[PDB]
Scaffold this active site. Structure first.
Site, PDB file in Angstrom:
ATOM      1  N   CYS A  76      37.313  49.061  41.946  1.00  0.00           N
ATOM      2  CA  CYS A  76      38.497  49.054  42.805  1.00  0.00           C
ATOM      3  C   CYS A  76      39.458  47.942  42.400  1.00  0.00           C
ATOM      4  O   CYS A  76      39.040  46.862  41.972  1.00  0.00           O
ATOM      5  CB  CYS A  76      38.081  48.895  44.279  1.00  0.00           C
ATOM      6  SG  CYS A  76      37.130  50.305  44.867  1.00  0.00           S
TER       7      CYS A  76
ATOM      8  N   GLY B 170      32.536  48.751  41.953  1.00  0.00           N
ATOM      9  CA  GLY B 170      33.187  47.513  41.563  1.00  0.00           C
ATOM     10  C   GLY B 170      34.497  47.673  40.824  1.00  0.00           C
ATOM     11  O   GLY B 170      35.114  46.667  40.462  1.00  0.00           O
TER      12      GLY B 170
ATOM     13  N   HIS C  30      41.131  47.253  51.477  1.00  0.00           N
ATOM     14  CA  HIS C  30      39.777  47.399  52.009  1.00  0.00           C
ATOM     15  C   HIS C  30      38.818  46.318  51.502  1.00  0.00           C
ATOM     16  O   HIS C  30      37.648  46.329  51.891  1.00  0.00           O
ATOM     17  CB  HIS C  30      39.211  48.811  51.753  1.00  0.00           C
ATOM     18  CG  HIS C  30      38.988  49.161  50.309  1.00  0.00           C
ATOM     19  ND1 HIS C  30      38.152  48.442  49.480  1.00  0.00           N
ATOM     20  CD2 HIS C  30      39.446  50.198  49.567  1.00  0.00           C
ATOM     21  CE1 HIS C  30      38.132  49.000  48.279  1.00  0.00           C
ATOM     22  NE2 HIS C  30      38.906  50.071  48.305  1.00  0.00           N
TER      23      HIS C  30
HETATM   24  O1  LIG Z   1      33.472  50.334  43.815  1.00  0.00           O
HETATM   25  C1  LIG Z   1      33.466  51.422  44.418  1.00  0.00           C
HETATM   26  C2  LIG Z   1      33.580  52.657  43.561  1.00  0.00           C
HETATM   27  C3  LIG Z   1      34.748  53.160  43.097  1.00  0.00           C
HETATM   28  C4  LIG Z   1      34.729  54.349  42.281  1.00  0.00           C
HETATM   29  O2  LIG Z   1      35.740  54.869  41.823  1.00  0.00           O
HETATM   30  N1  LIG Z   1      33.455  54.899  42.034  1.00  0.00           N
HETATM   31  C5  LIG Z   1      32.251  54.403  42.513  1.00  0.00           C
HETATM   32  O3  LIG Z   1      31.161  54.916  42.282  1.00  0.00           O
HETATM   33  N2  LIG Z   1      32.377  53.261  43.282  1.00  0.00           N
HETATM   34  N3  LIG Z   1      33.368  51.562  45.755  1.00  0.00           N
HETATM   35  C6  LIG Z   1      33.362  52.818  46.517  1.00  0.00           C
HETATM   36  C7  LIG Z   1      34.510  52.792  47.521  1.00  0.00           C
HETATM   37  N4  LIG Z   1      34.408  51.603  48.388  1.00  0.00           N
HETATM   38  C8  LIG Z   1      35.140  51.629  49.591  1.00  0.00           C
HETATM   39  C9  LIG Z   1      35.913  52.733  50.010  1.00  0.00           C
HETATM   40  C10 LIG Z   1      36.609  52.701  51.224  1.00  0.00           C
HETATM   41  C11 LIG Z   1      36.534  51.559  52.019  1.00  0.00           C
HETATM   42 CL1  LIG Z   1      37.393  51.465  53.564  1.00  0.00          CL
HETATM   43  C12 LIG Z   1      35.778  50.458  51.627  1.00  0.00           C
HETATM   44  C13 LIG Z   1      35.091  50.498  50.426  1.00  0.00           C
HETATM   45  C14 LIG Z   1      34.396  50.359  47.625  1.00  0.00           C
HETATM   46  C15 LIG Z   1      33.262  50.374  46.608  1.00  0.00           C
END
Ligand SMILES: O=C(c1cc(=O)[nH]c(=O)[nH]1)N1CCN(c2ccc(Cl)cc2)CC1
Ligand SMILES: O=C(c1cc(=O)[nH]c(=O)[nH]1)N1CCN(c2ccc(Cl)cc2)CC1
Lengths: 306, 306
Positions: B145, B143, B41
């Protein structure tokens, strides 16, 4: 979101750990530049632990009595000296993996990471606090002496603890890296016990702020109290008194949650008097005191390092 | 003695973490040999998260749309492909710090260490378990991920988890390193929730053995029970049923303490029905289920690693 007992990444420290052998005794050393630091009781035998005279024991040693191994490589000991309770072994080769570092003495209530080691080999990393009675509640087996505790400030490793011994109650005692013990302990086998421990109040408050940030709000209430009324209740329950400096330290967490410190103290006062009644806070049924305000900010805002 | 939530030393993994940018989105990647692995993603924009078609999104990219940074050094992307939910970026330079590694899928109840990272930079290490509902109770901010979970077997890093997202309840979901999700989750923003969690019984028993090893004995009793009578009580309290394989796994801890598994089960049955009544076990007022039998042995006997 979430909240975990989080340690610092240990890579920068793993490359400094060596094995030190003198006679029958093997333990861990810290190799920085061309010096290996280790507990001085590595030079004791079984007969010496009772009442060691370290000056005599050391004069009877020469450089070749000290086997220092960094993985497979053997390090040649060029000189040796004693600094308080630490032995400094000068070696012929400077550690190319020496990070930027400093030696700092921490205060009761502060936290650090411990890299537990055996035979110079890193085994595990965990976070703990220096208790108000100058012990740590570590996890250490035989052979762990010389394992170190540390913090990371951006690019710089601050070494604050070297492990020397386990006390009869199962808690642990050691020195700073200049060889000065934390607490009234000595590196001889005697009848030394830790004094009475207390709960680190400013840390409990920081953890309650972490809970609010993570959606645990059930313990909040509308009341406020004063420092002196809180401290009166705190003393009754073996909690460290709270100062204005502590209130100031908690400022950033007060700001982020909109809950004043003295407001949070009234919640804490209530928890001390009524208990938690089968409810939990951040997955705990006890009040946790081993996260500093800085630990919470770092984990609930996200600072990284080199 | 002592007992802590202990993570693996992270050094071998820290040297594999890189930053991956595609457009506006930056996250973490894992650089092994000449391949960088990261969540697919990273190629989505804000408009795409709702209902992404990853095949289309990827065909519209070329190698130069991918900025990969290892500290200061920039890595040139030579090729790219998708394997399930992970993107594999072939780069011009093989990571000289690539450890011996393998990719393994873990089972619910098993534990691993997480190296939480931001912008390719390691921030903290912590231990957690894969829950029976295939989520982990992590600690992750925006951030994070691409942060990975791992175990160490002697010299070998077994990568088992890559972080992809946080669910609405605050728990975390991800894939193995072949890109296959743990649990029934998808990498799109939809209305997906974790199913009901249960307590990992074999882990609770291992932790009770750790307690006995460390001198907490107050919950023991003289009774014994059978697997089927225990499992009848366990089901009532949302505990995973106990099998003969579990009993066998606990063998080494039974041997070291002289307390048969079914004997320990009778203590557990009592704790489930009466509670702990203000008493604690290893400093906890709740039954802990995130230590495996292997974690306990390792910490209460002392295995190290490369
Ligand atoms: O960094 C975090 C994150 C991770 C976490 O564990 N906790 C938090 O608060 N934030 N993102 C949330 C999930 N995002 C995402 C999900 C699905 C798709 Cl298709 C595209 C983007 C990416 C950014
Ligand atoms: O490795 C451990 C150890 C450390 C620990 O934390 N827990 C544990 O069980 N064992 N030793 C116990 C303390 N020893 C010692 C103390 C004083 C002197 Cl003068 C000389 C030797 C060294 C060996």
């Amino acid at each position: 979101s979430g909240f975990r007992k989080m340690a610092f990444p240990s890579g920068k420290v793993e490359g400094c750990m060596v094995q030190v052998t003198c006679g029958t005794t093997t333990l861990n050393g810290l190799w920085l530049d061309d010096v290996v630091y280790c507990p001085r009781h590595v030079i004791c035998t079984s007969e010496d632990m009772l009442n060691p005279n370290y000056e005599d024991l050391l004069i009877r040693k020469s450089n070749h009595n000290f086997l220092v191994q960094a993985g497979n490589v053997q390090l040649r000991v060029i000189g040796h000296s004693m600094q308080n309770c630490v032995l400094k072994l000068k070696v012929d080769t400077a550690n190319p993996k020496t990070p930027k570092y400093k030696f700092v003495r921490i205060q009761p209530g502060q936290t650090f990471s411990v890299l537990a080691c055996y035979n110079g080999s890193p085994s595990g990393v965990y976070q703990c606090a220096m208790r108000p009675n100058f012990t740590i509640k570590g996890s250490f087996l035989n052979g762990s002496c010389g394992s170190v505790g540390f913090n990371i400030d951006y690019d710089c490793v601050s070494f604050c603890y070297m492990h020397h011994m386990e006390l009869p109650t199962g808690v642990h005692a050691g020195t700073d890296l200049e060889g000065n013990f934390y607490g009234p302990f000595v590196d001889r086998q005697t009848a030394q016990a830790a004094g009475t421990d207390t709960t680190i109040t400013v840390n409990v408050l920081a953890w309650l702020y972490a809970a609010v940030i993570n959606g645990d709000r059930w313990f909040l209430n509308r009341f406020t109290t004063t420092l002196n009324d809180f401290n009166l209740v705190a003393m009754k329950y073996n909690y460290e008194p709270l100062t204005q400096d502590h209130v100031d330290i908690l400022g950033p967490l007060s700001a982020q949650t909109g809950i004043a410190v003295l407001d949070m103290c009234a919640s804490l006062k209530e928890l001390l008097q009524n208990g938690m009644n089968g409810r939990t806070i951040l997955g705990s049924a006890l009040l946790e005191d081993e996260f500093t305000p800085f630990d919470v900010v770092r984990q609930c805002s996200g600072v990284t390092f080199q």
